[PDB]
Amino acid sequence: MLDPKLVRTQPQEVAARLATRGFQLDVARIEALEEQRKSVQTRDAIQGELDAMLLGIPNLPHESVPVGADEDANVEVRRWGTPKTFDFEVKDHVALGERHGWLDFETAAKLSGARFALMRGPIARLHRALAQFMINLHTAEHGYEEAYTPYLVQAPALQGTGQLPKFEEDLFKIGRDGEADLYLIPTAEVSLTNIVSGQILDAKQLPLKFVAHTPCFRSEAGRDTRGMIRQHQFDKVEMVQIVDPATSYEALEGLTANAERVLQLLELPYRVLALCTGDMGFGSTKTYDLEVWVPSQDKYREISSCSNCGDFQARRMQARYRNPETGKPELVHTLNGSGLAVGRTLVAVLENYQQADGSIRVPEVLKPYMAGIEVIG
Amino acid sequence: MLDPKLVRTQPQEVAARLATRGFQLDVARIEALEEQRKSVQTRTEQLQAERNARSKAIGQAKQRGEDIAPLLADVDRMGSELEEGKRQLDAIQGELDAMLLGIPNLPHESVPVGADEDANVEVRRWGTPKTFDFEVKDHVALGERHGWLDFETAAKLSGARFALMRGPIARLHRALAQFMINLHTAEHGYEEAYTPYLVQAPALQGTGQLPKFEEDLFKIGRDGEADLYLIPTAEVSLTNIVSGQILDAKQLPLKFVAHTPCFRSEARDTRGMIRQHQFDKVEMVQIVDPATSYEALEGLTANAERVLQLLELPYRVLALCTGDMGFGSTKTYDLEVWVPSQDKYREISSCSNCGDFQARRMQARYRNPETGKPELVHTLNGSGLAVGRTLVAVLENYQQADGSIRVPEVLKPYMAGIEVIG
Ligand SMILES: Nc1ccn([C@@H]2O[C@H](COS(=O)(=O)NC(=O)[C@@H](N)CO)[C@@H](O)[C@H]2O)c(=O)n1
Ligand SMILES: Nc1ccn([C@@H]2O[C@H](COS(=O)(=O)NC(=O)[C@@H](N)CO)[C@@H](O)[C@H]2O)c(=O)n1
Ligand code: NA
Ligand code: NA
C-alpha cells in the first residue's frame, strides 16, 4: 500500500508517477470518497471501499528507474563472463537430461500433468547440490539467517507482501470447509517477509536478513511449454531483508551482488537488467533482473529478480521499528531477491557445462556435493 | 487391490483373513453380484444362440419363399435385449470394481493376529535412553529459548500445526535431511529422485490413498482441469514411477529415495512439531521381484534403523499386528525413537511390504524369466526418516543442563563449525 497521506496531499503527482507503470489511478473515486467522508463526519462503509482501492494500487517506482512501457525499455546495467563458443552442435537441457532418464517430463506428466518434472540419480543430485551450495553461501558469507517456513499460508500473509487481493489467479488455493483457506506459497518472500508483521522491532535488530530454500508453486495462469524453465513447482533459494528505510537502496545493490555471486562461483555468464517502470512487479520500487546465458537459446534468460519494496509491504503488514532518533515506531523497508531459482540454475548448468559426447562437466563448487562425480553421463 | 479372481471365487477365505484386521468383507453383496452376473451371462448366451439361429433361418425362409417379417422382428428384439444384457454386465463389473478398491490388503501369515495396538510386539531395541542429571525440557521449551523454533509466527502465517525454524535449529533440520539422503544413496543402494509434490488422482489411487482416504489430503480444485493433491508422502510419487510398465527382471530391484515436504489434513499432539500439516520426510521405496519382498522388508527396516544408530538415538522396533496396520500393507515394522520429556518411545518411521496390492492398482509389472508373461511386482516403502520427528529426538536426547544442544557427531560436517547450539 502507498502512503495514504500522499494519495490525499499529492493525488496528481502520485497518478503521474503511477502512469509510468501503465497504471491509471482512479483520482475521481478518491476525490469523491474524501468528499463523502468529510460530509458524513460533519453531519466504516466509506473506509472499507477506499481500503480495497488502496490495496489494488502498485508501488511507486523510484526516481532512478528507467521510464518505459515494456521489457524492450529495460536497461542492461552490466554483464559478467563470456558466453562459451562450442566446437559442436549445442543441445538443450531437455535433450541432455532425457538421454538416460535422469530428467523425465513424461513420468512427471503421467503423475501430475503438464509443467512438472521428475529428476533422477546424478541430475537429481546436481539439483540438490545447487540448492545446498546456495544456502551454504548466503549463510556463511552474506550474513543471512537460515529459515524453514510453512509452504502453505493463509490470505493475510499474501496480502502483507502484495499477491493478495489483486493476484489470486496466479496462486494454487486449497479450499477448506469451516476453516480459513490455504494457499501454496509462490515464493518464500511471502513467509519470510511476514515474520515481522504487526511488530515494532529494535533499531539494533536491523538489518534482518533471511534465507530459505523452498519449493514454489505457481498456477502460471497467464511460453516455455518445453522443459523446466516455467514449472508449476520449482525450488528457489530466497533472500529477504528487513531494513532501516535510509539504507534500502544501498541494500538493493548488496542483495543483487549476493545473487550475482552464485552465478560467478558457478562460472555462469550473465547480464544484469534494470527493469523499466512498465515492466516491474506490483510491489517493487526498483528491480534488477539477472539473466543467465542459455547456449541452446543463443540469449540470456531470467534466473533472478532482486527488488526493493520500500515501505509498501511494511504498510500492509504494520511492520515497524523504533527510530533511534525520534523514538517513534516507523515503517521498515523490505527487499527480496532470488539467489537463485534452482530449476533454472540446473538448466544453465546442464547447457553451459555440456561436452561433445553429451555428458555434463560438474561445476567446481558443486564437486564436494556430488559424491565423487565429476562428469555426468 | 486384492486378486479379483480370489475375492470372487473365495469370498469366505478372503473374508476370514480380513476379519483379523477387524474389517468385515461384504460377502453377501459379492455373492449377490456374482449370482446376477451368472443370471445375465446365461440369458445372453441363450439369446445369442437364439438370435444367430433366427438370422440364419431368414436365409432359409427366403429360399422357401416364406414371410421373413416374424423372424426379422424376433432378431430385432433379441439384439436389443443383448445390448441391454451387455450394459447390465458392465454395470455389475463396475460396481464390483468400485467395491474391490475399498478393501484393505491381506496381512502376511507371519503377522501376529490382534485386534488393537496392544497385540503389537517388540522385535528388538537399540541403545539406552539417557538418565539426565537435571529436569529434562521438551523440544518446545528448548527451541523457543532464542526463537529458533517458533510456532507463534507460523500460526500467524498459516494457523495451527505449522512451524517456523531459524538459524542453528533450521540448519540442524536441513543437516538431518541431507545426512539421511547422503546415507541412503552412498551406502544403501538407493537412487535419488526429485519429484512433483502435487499429483493427480490416479497416482493416489495407485498407492491406495484414493478412493477411500480423500479427506486426509489437501486438494487444489481446478476449473475445467484435473484436480491436484498435495502429496502426503513421497511414497505416492516414487512408487508411481513404474505405473503401467512391464519391467525387465534385470532392472529389479528398483530402489528410490526422495527428500520431500509431506502434507496431511490430519482429519493429539497440539503443542509441538510431532503432528504437523507439513513435515519433511526422507522416503525409501523399493520395486521388487515378488519372491524377494519379505527379505527386502527386513533390509528396508535396517536402512531406517541405521539413521537412528548413526545419530545414536535409542529406539525400538515393533512388528504391527493384523489390527494395527495401514490399508495397503501386508506386513509393517514401526520404528519408535526415545523422547526424554515424554518418558517413552514415539513413532519415527513405518516400513511396509505392500505385496502386489499397489502394483495391481497401477499395473506395475515385470516380465517373469521362467514364463515370459508379465507379472505384478511387489512394492515397499519406509521412512528413513520423518525429519521433523528426528529433530524433536535430537533436541531432547542431546540437551545439556543450561538448555544448550550438543550437535550429534554425524551432523557436525553440515553445521559449519557449530558443535553446541545455544
Ligand atoms: N514458474 C517459474 C516462475 C519464476 N521462476 C524464477 O523465479 C524467479 C523469482 O520469481 S519472481 O516472481 O521474479 N520474483 C520473486 O518471486 C521474488 N520473491 C524474488 O525471488 C524468477 O526470476 C524466475 O527466474 C521459475 O523458475 N519458474
Ligand atoms: N503429520 C505427521 C504424520 C506422520 N509423521 C511421520 O511420518 C512417518 C511415516 O508416515 S506413515 O503414514 O506412517 N507412513 C508413510 O507415509 C510411508 N510412506 C512410509 O514413510 C510416521 O511414522 C511418522 O513418524 C509425521 O512426522 N507427521
Ligand atoms: Na521476475
Ligand atoms: Na505409521
* Pocket residues: Cβ below 6 A from ligand 2: B 233, 235, 264, 266, 275-276, 279, 281, 283, 347-350, 381-383, 386, 388-389
Q: In what order do the strands lie in the sheet with A182-184?
A: A152-153, A182-184, A173-174
> Do the beta carbons of residue A359 and residue A376 sit within 8 Å?
yes
Q: Which member of B173, B243, B259 has the closest CB to residue A148?
A: B173
What is the per-residue DSSP string for B324-367? Answer: G--TT-SEEEEEEEEEGGGTEEEEEEEEEEEETHHHHHHT-EEE
B405 Cβ contact list (under 8 Å, min separation 6): B142, B172, B394, B395, B398, B399, B420, B421, B422
> Do the beta carbons of residue A284 and residue A309 sit within 8 Å?
yes
Cross-chain Cβ contact B193/A371 below 8 Å = no
Q: What pairs with residue A259 in β-bridges?
A: none
Question: Most distant CA pair in chain A: distance in Å?
Answer: 83
The residues of B annotated as belonging to the active site are 264, 275, 347, 350, 389
Shortest-distance atom of ligand 2 to CA B384: 20
Cross-chain Cβ contact B174/A146 below 8 Å = yes
Q: How many residues does chain B have?
A: 422
Identify all chain B residues contacting A180, using CB atoms and an 8 Å cutoff. Answer: 159
Q: What pairs with residue A329 in β-bridges?
A: A322
Q: What is the resolution of this structure in A?
A: 2.2
Method: X-ray
C-alpha closest to that of A173 among A149, A156, A194, A152? A152
Cell numbers that stand for B138 in this block: 521438551
Q: How far is the CA of B214 from the centre of ligand 2 (A)?
A: 17
What is the per-residue DSSP string for B298-314? Answer: HHHHHHHHHHHHHTT--
CA dihedral (A314, A311, A131, A96) positive or negative: positive
End-to-end CA distance of chain A: 51
Other beta carbons within 10 Å of B383: 27
Q: Which member of B193, B228, B278 has the closest CB to residue A120?
A: B193
Query: CA B52 to CA B40: how far, in whole Å?
Result: 18
Name the closest ligand to CA B392. 2
**A261: amino acid identity, one letter:** R
Q: What pairs with residue B319 in β-bridges?
A: B121, B333
End-to-end CA distance of chain B: 51
A202 Cβ contact list (under 8 Å, min separation 6): A321, A322
**What interhelical angle do B69-100 and B27-63 show, nearest 10?**
160
B377 Cβ contact list (under 8 Å, min separation 6): B242, B247, B252, B287, B288, B289, B290, B356, B359, B364, B365, B366
Chain centroid to CA B1: how far?
Answer: 12
**Interior/surface letters B79-88, b for 16+ CB within 10 angstroms, e for the rest:** eeebeebeeb
> Residue B110 has what DSSP assignment?
T
C-alpha closest to that of A114 among A6, A230, A216? A230
* Pocket residues: Cβ below 6 A from ligand 1: A 187, 189, 218, 220, 230-231, 234, 236, 238, 302-305, 336-338, 341, 343-344
* Long-range contacts formed by A288-292: CB under 8 A, 24+ apart: A288/A77, A288/A252, A288/A256, A289/A74, A290/A256, A290/A259, A290/A260, A290/A263, A290/A338, A290/A340, A292/A263, A292/A268, A292/A344, A292/A345, A292/A348
Nearest chain B alpha carbon to A119:
B194
The residues of A annotated as belonging to the active site are 218, 230, 302, 305, 344
Q: How far is the CA of B49 from the centre of ligand 1 (A)?
A: 68
Cis, peptide link before residue A83, omega less than 30° from 0: no
Cross-chain Cβ contact A112/B164 below 8 Å = no
Q: How far is the CA of B280 from the centre of ligand 4 (A)?
A: 15
Identify all chain B residues contacting A170, using CB atoms and an 8 Å cutoff. Answer: none
Query: CA A255 to CA A340: how far, in whole Å?
Result: 12
> Do the beta carbons of residue B116 and residue B323 sit within 8 Å?
yes
- Residue from A100, A105, A111 whose CB has the most chain B CBs within 10 Å, to mutate: A111
Q: Which member of A121, A154, A198 has the closest CB to residue B158?
A: A154
**A295: amino acid identity, one letter:** P
> Residue A142 has what DSSP assignment?
S
- Residue from A148, A184, A236, A347 whose CB has the most chain B CBs within 10 Å, to mutate: A148
Pocket probe mutation, ligand 1, options A153, A338, A346, max atoms within 8 Å of Cβ: A338
Query: CA B192 to CA B209: how far, in whole Å?
Result: 23
Pairing of strands B420-421, B374-376: unpaired
B233 Cβ contact list (under 8 Å, min separation 6): B260, B262, B281, B283, B381
Query: CA B262 to CA B353: how far, in whole Å?
Result: 21
Annotated binding site of A for L-serine: 187-189, 218, 238, 336, 338
Question: Cα–Cα–Cα angle for A12, A13, A16, nearest 5°?
Answer: 85
Residue-range domains of chain B with CATH: 1-104 (1.10.287.40), 105-422 (3.30.930.10)
Block residue for cell numbers 544501498: A250
Q: What pairs with residue B192 in β-bridges?
A: B257
C-alpha closest to that of B323 among B103, B24, B14, B19? B19
